Symmetry: D4
Subunit: 161 residues, 8 copies
């Protein structure tokens, strides 16, 4: 069965990270969500990452802000693909988040999304694309999603009043 984990260091991250869960629901991909802090709960992060695959999780989506270490550290402790969402910060508006997630050393990858809500939405969509390789029923849903994007642009044509 398909399963994604959606994780973040604080419940304050939820307004953003819920966008990943919204897309997973749209594609009918099961997920778990939880607060896992790289800095406040480092041992609970290590346990989560290490145990994820054997628990049946296929992909981890992880959001973090500032000195954003959660995605990279989780990726270092699992063989699963990890998608990292940079969360926008008060001062640097997510530039710190972006660089601290994307610039991983050769050897340990993180699939980095856009900063903020767009990135959280894209993490869910990216997870659906990844899962569509082994789960062919998703391909049709992905085709229909693409059609919905075309429809959205058509719907916007009369909004340049």
């Amino acid at each position: 069965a398909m399963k994604v984990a959606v994780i973040m260091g604080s419940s304050s991250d939820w307004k953003i990270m819920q966008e990943s869960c919204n897309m997973l629901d749209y594609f009918e991909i099961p997920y778990e969500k939880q607060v896992v802090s790289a800095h406040r709960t480092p041992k609970m992060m290590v346990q989560f990452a290490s145990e994820a695959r054997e628990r049946g999780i296929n992909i981890i989506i992880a959001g973090a802000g500032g000195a954003a270490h959660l995605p990279g550290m989780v990726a270092s402790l699992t063989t699963l693909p990890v998608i990292g969402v940079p969360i926008e910060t008060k001062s640097l508006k997510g530039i710190d988040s972006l660089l601290s997630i994307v610039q991983m050393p050769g050897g340990i990858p993180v699939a980095t999304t856009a900063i903020g809500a767009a990135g959280a939405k894209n993490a869910g969509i990216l997870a659906a694309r990844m899962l569509s390789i082994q789960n062919p029923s998703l391909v049709e849903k992905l085709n229909q999603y693409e059609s919905s994007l075309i429809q959205k642009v058509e719907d916007m044509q009369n909004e340049l009043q």
Copy 2:
């Protein structure tokens, strides 16, 4: 049967993108490679991206620098996951490459790697992690890879002379 496409806009990007191919070889994942330019051959890009899935491609790794539109445009034209590698730029150090790739709108994701050779290496490893959901024999190889990372660090212990 697993297959990854490794693409880039120029042959001058090959010195970097060869790292992706190197890692795909390490995991025994079949690949094809070619030059696909978003700006010099936009129609060929459209055809390549649109037809990749039906031909048997599972993942596209796309490298580009500067006004680095290739990964995001390819992603817009396929239901496959696309991994985008920002190439370092002589002037702006790959900052233009990075922002052009990572900041995709909600709706069309690109899995963005680190700038340069690190990102290309990571694109290959990430593709293996993605394919390990569908192809379970890759998990053992990914575990072996972890072990080799640990050994690399052990070998460095006496080099602090």
Copy 3:
């Protein structure tokens, strides 16, 4: 007959891109406006750009933000001059938009203006200057616009309180 096209990937961009249309109206230059999304409607973008010259469009003004690919992709698909307007973004302050548009490779130019409303207004004025080469009636209008700018400065003198 003169004709300009003003395009953007979202009706959310209209608040900015209307500035281009406002200046086209000032110079009495006919135009069309449309939503054309590089990522949500890539095939329609290809058709729009490819057909533009045959449809009698002389200049394309294209606005985009973030991973701002619309102007450069349109420019790759027509030999008309394309003016690219970077739209301000809520993390990188349009720096992503700007670099994505201006850093086009040798071979495929985009005439880039300032981030935001200033750039959209200036795209309209720039289109007027471009069209004045082969439409001499515009030269008088451009001279009169100079006079209006000088007058606007005079009208500001009493505001330094």
Copy 4:
């Protein structure tokens, strides 16, 4: 007859700006090249820009680096379209050049291209596209140029 002016503040900019001239020659578009400095010869710059249109210039391509004021000041003094090429600098890699040129407030436009040689090459090509409006001969030349760009990529298929 068509005519483009290619200008720059220093002879040190010539290697870069010749890329503009090379593309103008490729498209058989006449041009003049000159050194015109916004900061060292401000009055000459004013005269050049003010008189350009009456002297038969259709487009001005202006390269500048650092506190790059030449394109914007020329644009403020002519009704002609001005294309600005940011020249790479040593400290800031042309970022100062780029922002000084592109960020014109509403009212006076500059068409800005990429930093350095790529931008210089593109200024010449952009000038050709501007002059191609309802001009089938130039449209043909631009289409042939497209064909060379496609060929360039197809040739690279074996260089991996």
Copy 5:
């Protein structure tokens, strides 16, 4: 007799440049203030800069935003010292203004101060320091201003509630 001119391209800049005038008033230094746009009124800019010294202007303080050319062009057209104040821009927060002003080539100097109100206030104070060389009675006022700065800090001590 001492005189300073305070100039800017738009009345939108006045809410910043007013701090220059406020400090000049505090030091009892006569000034004039005017809108002079490098882009909208280039010929009047040339005239203003060229005539300033013979008119008895001692120093020009010039504010500009974005592609901020006013201070550098004025400096090129006068032998007077020119103080340049970068104005914060909506998108790039005055980094464009700052680089456009400060990065003048060797040969034509601009005395650059901080982005925004701090820079405008400091331009007025700097002008007083410059004028104090040939106008000795200003030294006493500058000493009194320093005393006022020490008092301001003392007044803040009970505000750490």
Copy 6:
């Protein structure tokens, strides 16, 4: 008996981190050095950091570049003060390193120094300052160090 640990994710960081050890030797402060990688040896990192205090370590100096997670993760796992040295990166000039180290959210601190060799030298000096609290012998050494800095400047006066 005070002890400092100097750690880094690669021996290729030793180029920079040796400067920390050099200053510790200058102040006669005992130390150990080790390669500890946040991404390649995360489980070892956890052991090193969580056990540091029981191992007799008083201060940890950690260098890292790029996605520079080592100092912050180490800090999250110990009650010891952690000094983080950002290592210059070929592309982003250590700005990625700096932001990934300094921008710790409220709750877990890292004492961050300058990018590169300056920062590594300063991490060693900062550790000395930390150990000097109410320690007159180290205070004396720091005073002598101050005098050497003054002398260095005096020595440069005839070089203008």
Copy 7:
């Protein structure tokens, strides 16, 4: 007895710097707080820094913004550890503050924390960790704080709604 000093150039900085004092209170570490401006009260700064150790201060936490010189100058005038907190600035969002503080030359260190409230809170915690070396009672309090952070994360699990 333990003692920390918390200083800042302006009472405007207090709403941020009070977080340092809040954490020192949490750990029962005695402190003094004062406005000390590197630029408005340079002589008083020099005296404060020079006398701090003699007066029994163990650690100085100093906040500063813009051309942020307070932490580096204080550090040059004491052999005590100095913690520098970059204050968020209106225009550059504390990037100026950060670079001005962190980029100290080899020879004179400043322990730099994050921009804004995070850095101020962390300066107090960092001072507690520093003092725990020679004040063993603080180790227990630091252990308590660690446990509290874990409990706070556990309390957030039901807030993803």
Copy 8:
């Protein structure tokens, strides 16, 4: 007599700062030069700044890199105009130097010039313009310098014929 002081933290800065002295010599303006380190010799810095005016110094030119505090701290301690030259740094290309110098909060000004050699050259010229208010023989020399700049450009025009 007129007198300028040219100061810097290290003899490593002399290759750059000598450009200021070159221009002072061009205008026959007397000067002294000294190494003054804000961080290694802070008390000498305080003394130098505080005593400069009574000794006959009219203007201080100060160069500094990195956490470049010398110009701002000197300015805080004198009523003289202070010109600050940002010295290029290895990692950050003088961006740290620039922001640490130019971003002075309102109250204490520094006249900032370009990064590196251009800025040092311009500090000397700016000092001449400042001194020309009080010393009218300089106006003639500044007019001569204007003419020399025109000739330099004419020389380039003629060489490229």
